[PDB]
Design an enzyme around this catalytic site. Structure first.
Site, PDB file in Angstrom:
ATOM      1  N   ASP A   8       0.784  -1.287  -0.069  1.00 34.27           N
ATOM      2  CA  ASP A   8      -0.038   0.023  -0.059  1.00 34.27           C
ATOM      3  C   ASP A   8       0.979   1.407   0.125  1.00 34.27           C
ATOM      4  OD1 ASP A   8      -2.362   1.102  -0.205  1.00 34.27           O
ATOM      5  OD2 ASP A   8      -2.716   1.384   1.835  1.00 34.27           O
ATOM      6  N   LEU A   9       0.278   2.280  -0.433  1.00 36.04           N
ATOM      7  CA  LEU A   9       1.055   3.829  -0.156  1.00 36.04           C
ATOM      8  C   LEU A   9       0.838   4.268   1.027  1.00 36.04           C
ATOM      9  CD1 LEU A   9       2.678   5.755  -2.121  1.00 36.04           C
ATOM     10  CD2 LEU A   9       0.405   6.722  -2.672  1.00 36.04           C
ATOM     11  N   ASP A  10      -0.463   4.771   1.410  1.00 37.26           N
ATOM     12  CA  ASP A  10      -0.695   5.463   2.753  1.00 37.26           C
ATOM     13  C   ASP A  10      -0.455   4.668   4.041  1.00 37.26           C
ATOM     14  OD1 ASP A  10      -1.904   7.837   4.032  1.00 37.26           O
ATOM     15  OD2 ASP A  10      -3.829   6.394   4.344  1.00 37.26           O
ATOM     16  N   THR A  16      -0.555  10.068   3.089  1.00 40.72           N
ATOM     17  CA  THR A  16      -1.538  10.878   2.083  1.00 40.72           C
ATOM     18  C   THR A  16      -2.864  11.196   2.983  1.00 40.72           C
ATOM     19  OG1 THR A  16      -2.581   8.767   1.075  1.00 40.72           O
ATOM     20  CG2 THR A  16      -0.761   9.605  -0.037  1.00 40.72           C
ATOM     21  N   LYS A  45     -12.026   9.263   6.286  1.00 44.32           N
ATOM     22  CA  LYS A  45     -10.984   8.158   6.024  1.00 44.32           C
ATOM     23  C   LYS A  45     -11.342   7.118   5.099  1.00 44.32           C
ATOM     24  CE  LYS A  45      -6.766   8.582   8.880  1.00 44.32           C
ATOM     25  NZ  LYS A  45      -5.333   8.126   8.791  1.00 44.32           N
ATOM     26  N   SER A 114      -2.609   0.106  -4.465  1.00 53.28           N
ATOM     27  CA  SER A 114      -3.139   1.304  -3.724  1.00 53.28           C
ATOM     28  C   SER A 114      -4.240   2.036  -4.595  1.00 53.28           C
ATOM     29  CB  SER A 114      -1.774   2.373  -3.598  1.00 53.28           C
ATOM     30  OG  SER A 114      -2.544   3.926  -3.313  1.00 53.28           O
ATOM     31  N   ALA A 115      -5.306   2.367  -3.731  1.00 50.63           N
ATOM     32  CA  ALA A 115      -6.496   3.243  -4.305  1.00 50.63           C
ATOM     33  C   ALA A 115      -6.184   4.330  -4.925  1.00 50.63           C
ATOM     34  CB  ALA A 115      -7.557   3.259  -3.309  1.00 50.63           C
ATOM     35  N   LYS A 145     -10.583  -2.447  -1.812  1.00 52.72           N
ATOM     36  CA  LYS A 145     -10.522  -3.119  -0.691  1.00 52.72           C
ATOM     37  C   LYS A 145     -11.555  -3.032   0.570  1.00 52.72           C
ATOM     38  CE  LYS A 145      -5.668  -1.422  -0.937  1.00 52.72           C
ATOM     39  NZ  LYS A 145      -4.574  -0.531  -0.421  1.00 52.72           N
ATOM     40  N   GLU A 169       0.512  -3.642   4.681  1.00 49.27           N
ATOM     41  CA  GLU A 169      -0.689  -2.763   5.168  1.00 49.27           C
ATOM     42  C   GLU A 169      -0.926  -2.423   6.474  1.00 49.27           C
ATOM     43  OE1 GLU A 169      -2.740  -0.788   3.980  1.00 49.27           O
ATOM     44  OE2 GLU A 169      -3.899  -1.449   2.359  1.00 49.27           O
ATOM     45  N   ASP A 170      -1.471  -1.275   6.517  1.00 49.14           N
ATOM     46  CA  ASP A 170      -1.752  -0.593   8.012  1.00 49.14           C
ATOM     47  C   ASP A 170      -3.295  -0.614   8.202  1.00 49.14           C
ATOM     48  OD1 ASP A 170      -2.510   1.211   6.153  1.00 49.14           O
ATOM     49  OD2 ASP A 170      -2.245   2.832   7.815  1.00 49.14           O
TER      50      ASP A 170
HETATM   51 MG   LIG Z   1      -2.961   1.693   3.755  1.00 45.78          MG
END
Ligand SMILES: [Mg+2]
Length: 220
Positions: A8-10, A16, A45, A114-115, A145, A169-170
Site C-alpha cells: 500500500d502507499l498511505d 496521504t 478516511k 493502492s487506491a 479493499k 498494509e496498515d
Molecule cells: Mg494503507
C-alpha cells in the site's frame, strides 16, 4: 522464498491521509463550515467523496444543488492535487527506502497496490519510481479493499501469483484484502486494530528484508 512484495502507499510508504484531511478542511472553511478537525476526519478516511461531502455539509445543515455538490467535490480534488505538489523524498516513511533497495538487489519484485489516483505521481516525487516493477491501476480494478482485486492485479502485473507474495498494509480492509488474495500480510500498527492472527510490527522501521524472510519461513 517470497518472489514479490505488494505495498500500500498511505500508512506504509508515506502519509496521504494528511493531505486529504487538509483538502477537506480547506473546502469546509472555504464555504464557512467547520468542525472539520482530525477527530471528525476519522469519519472521512477511506470513504467515498460523496459520503465525505454529505457528512461535512451536515455539520452546518447545509443544502446544495446537484451542480453545487459536483463543484464542491471537484474543488476538493483540486485542493488535494495542489497540496501534494510539496511531496518529496523527505516524506518517505522510515526503513522504506532501504527495504526497497534490498528487495531490488535480491531480485524480488515490488508492486504498488493502492487506491491512490496519484500513486505514479507520488512515487515519482519521492524518487521511488525506479524500485517499482508495477503500479496497480485502481481505475482498472473492479472492487476496492477489502476485496482482494487490487493485490491480485499488483502480483499479476509483476508476473507472480499472490501466494508467492507478501503484502504490507496498515488498515483492517487492506489486511483482509491481502489475506483473500492468497498473499501473506505483515501489518504495521496495533494488533488492537489489525488482528491477533498476523505478524504486526509497531512502525515501518521494522519492515526489513531480514525480518520479512524470517516471517515467510515461519508462516502457515
Ligand atoms: Mg494503507
Amino acid at each position: 522464498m517470497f518472489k514479490a512484495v505488494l505495498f500500500d502507499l498511505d500508512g506504509v510508504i508515506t502519509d496521504t491521509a494528511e493531505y486529504h484531511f487538509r483538502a477537506w478542511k480547506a473546502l469546509a472553511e472555504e464555504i464557512g463550515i467547520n468542525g472539520v478537525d482530525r477527530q471528525f476526519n476519522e469519519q472521512l478516511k477511506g470513504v467515498s467523496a460523496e459520503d465525505s461531502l454529505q457528512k461535512i455539509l451536515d455539520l452546518a445543515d447545509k443544502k446544495v444543488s446537484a451542480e453545487e455538490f459536483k463543484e464542491l467535490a471537484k474543488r476538493k480534488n483540486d485542493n488535494y492535487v495542489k497540496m501534494i505538489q510539496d511531496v518529496s523524498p523527505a516524506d518517505v516513511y522510515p526503513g522504506i527506502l532501504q527495504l526497497l533497495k534490498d528487495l531490488r538487489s535480491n531480485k524480488i519484485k515490488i508492486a504498488l497496490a493502492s487506491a491512490s489516483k496519484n500513486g505514479p505521481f507520488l512515487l515519482e516525487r519521492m524518487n521511488l519510481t525506479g524500485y517499482f516493477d508495477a503500479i496497480a491501476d485502481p481505475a482498472e480494478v473492479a472492487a476496492s479493499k477489502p476485496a482482494p482485486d487490487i493485490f491480485i492485479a499488483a502480483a499479476h502485473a509483476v508476473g507472480v501469483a499472490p501466494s508467492e507474495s507478501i503484502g504490507l498494509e496498515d488498515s483492517q480492509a487492506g489486511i483482509q484484502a491481502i489475506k483473500d488474495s492468497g498473499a501473506l500480510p505483515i501489518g504495521v500498527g496495533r494488533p488492537e486494530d489489525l488482528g491477533d492472527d498476523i505478524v504486526i510490527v509497531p512502525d515501518t522501521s521494522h519492515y526489513t528484508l531480514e525480518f520479512l524472510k524470517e516471517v515467510w519461513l515461519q508462516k502457515q
